[PDB]
Amino acid sequence: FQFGIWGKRDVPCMLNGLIVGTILERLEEDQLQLSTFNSQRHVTPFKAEVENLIRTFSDVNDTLDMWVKVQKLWTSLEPVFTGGDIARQMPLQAKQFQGIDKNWMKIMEKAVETKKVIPCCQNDMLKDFLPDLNRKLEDCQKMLEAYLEGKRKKFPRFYFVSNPTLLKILSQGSEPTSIQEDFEKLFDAITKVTFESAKDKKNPALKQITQIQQVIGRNEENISLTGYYVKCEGNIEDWLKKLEQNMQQTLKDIASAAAQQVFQVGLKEFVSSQASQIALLGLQILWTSKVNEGLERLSRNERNAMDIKRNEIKEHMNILSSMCLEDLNGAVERTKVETLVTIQVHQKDISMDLKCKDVNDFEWQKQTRIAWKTDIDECIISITDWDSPYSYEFLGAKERLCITPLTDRCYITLAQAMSMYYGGAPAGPAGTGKTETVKDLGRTLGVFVVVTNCSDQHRYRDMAKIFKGLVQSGLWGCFDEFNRIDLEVLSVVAMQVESITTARKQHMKKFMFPEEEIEIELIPTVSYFITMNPGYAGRQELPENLKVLFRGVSMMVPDREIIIKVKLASVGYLQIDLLAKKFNVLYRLCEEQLSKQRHYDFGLRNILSVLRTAGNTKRQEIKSDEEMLLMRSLRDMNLSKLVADDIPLFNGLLADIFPKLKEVPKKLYPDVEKKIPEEINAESYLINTPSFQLKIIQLYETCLVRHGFMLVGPTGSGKSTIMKILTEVLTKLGSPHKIVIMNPKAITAEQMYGVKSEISDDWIPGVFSTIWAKSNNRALKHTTWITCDGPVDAIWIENLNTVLDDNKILTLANGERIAMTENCKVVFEVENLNNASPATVSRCGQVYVSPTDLGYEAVIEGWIRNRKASGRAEESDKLGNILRKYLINMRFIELQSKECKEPMMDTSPVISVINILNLLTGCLQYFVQTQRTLSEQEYEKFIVYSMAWAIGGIYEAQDRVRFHELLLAKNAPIPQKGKENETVFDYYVSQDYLDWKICSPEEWVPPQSLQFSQLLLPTLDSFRAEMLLNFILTQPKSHTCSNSALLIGGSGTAKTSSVLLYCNKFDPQKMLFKRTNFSSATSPFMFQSTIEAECDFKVGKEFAPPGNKMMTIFIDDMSMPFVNKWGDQITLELVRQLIETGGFYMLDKTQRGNQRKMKNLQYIGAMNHPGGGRNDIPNRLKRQFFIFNMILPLSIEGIYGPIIKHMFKQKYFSDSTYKVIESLTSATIALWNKVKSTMLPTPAKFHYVFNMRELSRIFKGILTCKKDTINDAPKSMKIKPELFLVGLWRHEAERVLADK
Amino acid sequence: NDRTLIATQNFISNVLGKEFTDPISYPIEGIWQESSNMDPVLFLLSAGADPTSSIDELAKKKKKFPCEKVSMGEGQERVARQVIMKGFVEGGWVILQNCHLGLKFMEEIETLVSPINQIHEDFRLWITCEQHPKFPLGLLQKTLKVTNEPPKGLKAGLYKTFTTIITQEFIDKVDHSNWRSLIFTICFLHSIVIERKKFGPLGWCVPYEYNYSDLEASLLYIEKYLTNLMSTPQPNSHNLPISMNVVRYMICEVQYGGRITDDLDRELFITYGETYLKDGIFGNDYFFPQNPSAELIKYQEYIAKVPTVDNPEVFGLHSNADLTFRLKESKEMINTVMETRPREEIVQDKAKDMLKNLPPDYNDVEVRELVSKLGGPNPKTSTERGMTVPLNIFLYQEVTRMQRVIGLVRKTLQDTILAIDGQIIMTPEILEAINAIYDAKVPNSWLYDPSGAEISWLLPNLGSWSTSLSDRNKQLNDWLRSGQRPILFWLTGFFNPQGFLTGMKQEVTRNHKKEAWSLDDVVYSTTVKEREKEPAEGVYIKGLYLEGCKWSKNGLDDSDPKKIFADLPILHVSAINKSNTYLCPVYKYPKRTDKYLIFRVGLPCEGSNNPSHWKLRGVALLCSTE
């Protein structure tokens, strides 16, 4: 119990736990240990103790969480109401805050009295107060926005910051501590600043800034001194403004010096001495001045001096290239050098062919020249005509890019557009260098750029906030993906941007902004950019008011050869020009003449990934020939994505370009490859195979290189297992690893990223963003991998372009921007892309699992390994001695060997194998229970029985008899004792002895006469259904068993009948039940609601005494929910996350990143013969449910017999009418057959649909008049007693059939 | 039917008077006289045209104040209302914008503009909108409707442009000689390249929305260039000492480069620059099309003597272009008026008889066998083999995609007829299929997918679509069942032509000069087999179509026969290094985009006409004919 107190500056003290990470984490594995113990068999005593313990632990957590959150709210609002004026100006909530201060102090003093946080949490009064206080503090913030707007006005950059984080920024309460974690999202590149206390007389020593630091990685950094200092004060805006100014001034003066030092000292000294930005400026200014001097010297007369200057540049090249590239210390220092090298390469390339006679010549007036004017001490950068001064922003070493001619076209275009006061809006396909070209023109001109990410959930207020910040500050904006935005928002944005354009045109210092009453100033060097993306799904047009402003730049085909060759120069290679052609031709040929698959990509993102890989390999000691290293790099990079067939074509293509080289081994990493089999053996049910080695190692490499990745591949292929085992091996050698899961189309995107509330005018938090904020904190030890898991629909994914691009910054419609760290990775366990534009295919790496990587046979061997765990007497060997040959050499001779051309549920056969295994375990469970071991022959019979169904469950009687004949021809014995035109399915194997018999027990009814009271009878179909169901439903949650079932049958084929017959047999004293039905417009929120109401408790946190009994969830028809237009329905996914993992994310407007847990449930479903007009369920979900047919009975003469018997035995006056009555029971059926066959539905008579319901309705009408029918005596209108009866039959049949 | 429309103008002139068939252009100053305060001015606009600048200009000329503007959207009702109240009390002008969305405010306006609520004089209202039905006609019944799409004729657009930026751009010179001529050049260029699009894909691959913004951008540039050139000129030899090659590059790639999405359009537009600028201001020459004197009303007269209807050789483009334009124009015109006048039947039986005429599937268990059994580039060179030879793997890929389409067609025809004659709950997709089968167009189910899955999109249901698919499968089968490589390959049939050509490259590298020749060293070329009546390296292609000349000794096409056969263009490949020539494209479909560009072919057959003649003439070697 060590806590950190804010301060003693009043009577009370307010405190927080800065060790609470240890508390939370050690708690997590505590409860893991406790559940681990309890689940094991030998843990009889602890239940009385342990549960109480866990309960307290669980409970204390959420109380603590609520408390600390409220503290943060209060810890934002204290400095607000210390100031006199604002407290006066709004007395009401100021006194409300006096009240909360009283209550809060009382809570704190109670906690102080306790001395121990656990009794402190145990108090019950606390819990009522905390959330009401939370809501009131939200109201207080909703008062304070009116002052926030003014405070934002007083300093520009706060427009690029959200509300509550702005409050936290403003509640410093300290010079160093509070802002030391926020410099990143308030400047460009600064992260750390020293603080030196100067002790003024009688005042406490004031901390003042003296130098600034840019940290990248862990230890590598760049430091910048300051002569002019910056001192903290009482007003935060003041010392922030001074920081900005004094930075600008010292940058200017250091540059003013450095421009003399460049030509005085000589190349190496000032490049080594200065920082990166100043060094690059120095190189450019040297070259332009010397080239100028050469050109005039040519103008005077024919001279070599121009050639001497060009030769001087050529000489500089060798000295820079020889030493500083191969050997060097540190990452930042490394990046600096090749940033110089690329520029110098392009420099000499231009200077070679630079045949211009004088400065006025266009060839000289085409590049980005520079001049640091002395007479008026100032920088000035120059283009064809345009000119502008350097903006003096400290950026340190940034990885600026190569200069193809297309970039020159952009530079000239954008300079012209800015000279005419517009904003460039480049366009093209994905991945051609738009955003990065914009950012580089920003970087070279010395300005700071602010990328955002528009999306459909935007509103014009935030765009106004942005644009106000842009005009006030002097910065540049690049609204990436500007098109995917609402139409009317663009309509009003047209006005805003036109106003600012006209304002800037006049050169007016002060101007008026629409919608915003206060007058606001301007600084000239601003600009606007939108990198829109022409033509996809979910993409609107710009109304013609807005096309006026922006000038177009068509970026369709980037160059690909020059960039490669100059990058290879930058690393320092020697075989440049040949290799460049090799790269280009190989990637081209691969693009065109290879097979067409959606997920393939060979664009510039892949190429740059290969280059940034290839740096290290040359940096290694080997002096081997470059082309070998390069073949290895390219091949080993591009192997992962390719499907089975394309691999031979790919490396046959490789051979045609590098015929000199024969083969090279793949560089194999020894630690991981030795480590993998260790844990594969550590588990029970894991078989190692070479394909797993290959795929898991490939996953390791793509993890090592790129941000995020995808595991594309079909169902049942082992993706999740691969991820789990990889995380295990990484954790084994230190460097832990944690994994989170999510399902994107089982929650609405508005909830995923959060929106502004549509009732109370106030923001709500977003789930995925909450996980992001919780994950990317530094000072942690995990390495989190956020897993999305579902389909890839463009609408929700595509607004993560910034996070998956090189920006690696998240951006919201809130106005909130969160910076990525290397602690975090993003992964997708998606089946396959079918609704993805290349803008998302090319952003992330990928790995393809294939169906044959893990055959079903390997899964069988894993189950076998489990059988030799405990029941290891001989069973594994004996069972299998039939299984192996009986399964390998049989299953594929059923799909289409014999016709079998109506498999109502198309499937991949691995699901059938999982099914038969799960059935067989339940089959042998009884003899597992009694500890009895059987002979081989009985086991063979059992396997025949098991797999008869579960491959025979998806076929009709004709296909079933052909199946049966196959089994007769080439399989172990089926019943042969009678087999009197009865299939193998008809009989079952008995536990007591090796026999094939079947029957349905006799049972009549209770005395009640309601048709419901005549509920249902003991049929054969129902009994066999219970027989199959009960086996699976008894199995206790084995791996590959979800304990979930599913029937298939026509509309009106005894679905709810048999299910309800089962359900009545439950024992409500330890086994409950629940009903639900489905329609088209049932949404995930509805299913969420019904399941939450079903459990009524969070049984994860040691709760639910009444749900401790076992419950079942029954659903009639999983098909009917509305399939989305793409083909991916959005309701079943919540079910699939419920079955697969249990639980889901909450939506109660209070907390987001957390999930309820179901520790016990059961599941059952029923289908309607999918195909044609009937929908189908997602294929990913088919792996879990037991599926089999539900045929019509073919015995309906024998279902209704009894009810007529019980009606009959009342009068006893039917000397002959009994035989008649039975003939009615059969003649109704004859009529049913004839009418149902003869007259059909057509789309003009579509509802002409017949089933077995109408027979029940006919009888329900007949069954009336227990003795009133006898009373023919009043009428006797030529009526025998039977005549009235047949007339009743006639009228009944008419009214149930001759109406519709 | 070709010359319907001028005849239309003719008898209209006869029965109603020629005054009707004569130009009109609305003087906005004249139009203002119509607008009283109590009626607004609507504007039904089109893409790439807005009178907002001119409205503002007038509001600065006659009225003395700037207008206020409110753009429709969301959350602008009350803003609009309060500014309108300010206008009511005062008498300013208001500019609503984008009424095509946010229509809930429109119904209120009719109640506002009423005699009841009194309004100060001189208050006007200006409304702009677009084609949105479900737009209540309260104001459509009471307003002034005006249209400002750009003018049609060459002289029409030229004259309008000569009433946009005039009389102070023109009159501010300080030089009657050089830059007067530059204005005239750029204006003519503008009016020509805009009007080129009238023809269709021959003139421009897609439509582009050039307007004046680019013009005055260029004018601002070049005036800076001349002012700062002559700022150092103390004396003019003959009025200037310009080196006008930079201006070429600027007007080519920067100002007008914004809209251009295609590659070919770049050099096409550079060519137009070459031929029109000439690289010099002659001062004495005949434009290909007269040349000016140096007075303003003389320019007006110059416009006056321009013909109304021109001929496409003014653009350099062949007369026959005219033909196709008129036909499609006529084909729509009557249809318009044809609208104003006051299924589940034997058609499905016709389809039922169809589906027993398309060929059977090819099971892969058989096809993998058959492709593995036989294959080689040359029987002497190699023994039979599968994977290794590029053309065999191409055979397998093509058969795969063909079967993928065959299965879908057979299945959907079945399930379309098995809903009525058969039984199933009716689908919407199947209903769309029924409607498509009755009409000429095939259903979308066989052309596109949610992203894109283009197969063989042709017009008719069976006239060409199934005909084309049948021909493809026939040739592919005989390319397989016999297994022998035939002569005269049909390029149109292959789904991916480019793979064919690169496989040919790989074949030449391996079989010949292997290694002496590397893959990256090889380059491409073609020799046109100039012969009717007739192996070595290369291939023989059958079925290409030229547009607008002969094979060799290329000449002007006659009035008919716009699309002409292409002779056997046998290929050729050679190791690298081991301007009279003209380079043509090869488009799969006649839509003519960046996509579908299979390869480029050098065609030396020049005589006296230099290649730029052909480049402006827009020749090409397309593949299909539709």
Ligand SMILES: Nc1ncnc2c1ncn2[C@@H]1O[C@H](COP(=O)(O)OP(=O)(O)OP(=O)(O)O)[C@@H](O)[C@H]1O
């Ligand atoms: N090494 C192994 N040995 C034996 N069986 C294995 C092994 N690895 C995985 N399996 C089996 O394979 C199945 C894994 O399926 P998994 O859950 O990975 O499917 P997936 O690829 O995640 O796709 P989805 O998530 O859609 O099911 C389980 O039945 C598991 O028992």
Ligand SMILES: Nc1ncnc2c1ncn2[C@@H]1O[C@H](COP(=O)(O)OP(=O)(O)O)[C@@H](O)[C@H]1O
């Ligand atoms: N000329 C170039 N030099 C270096 N890298 C380039 C160049 N052009 C494109 N790139 C690379 O392409 C990626 C940027 O693509 P981007 O412009 O974000 O695509 P989009 O414009 O579709 O968003 C970066 O990896 C960038 O380095």
Ligand SMILES: Nc1ncnc2c1ncn2[C@@H]1O[C@H](COP(=O)(O)OP(=O)(O)O)[C@@H](O)[C@H]1O
């Ligand atoms: N064992 C039985 N005894 C009596 N009536 C039955 C029995 N089985 C089915 N029925 C009758 O047949 C009908 C079948 O309807 P049902 O199976 O509920 O439709 P669906 O197949 O769409 O769920 C039931 O309404 C029931 O009255």
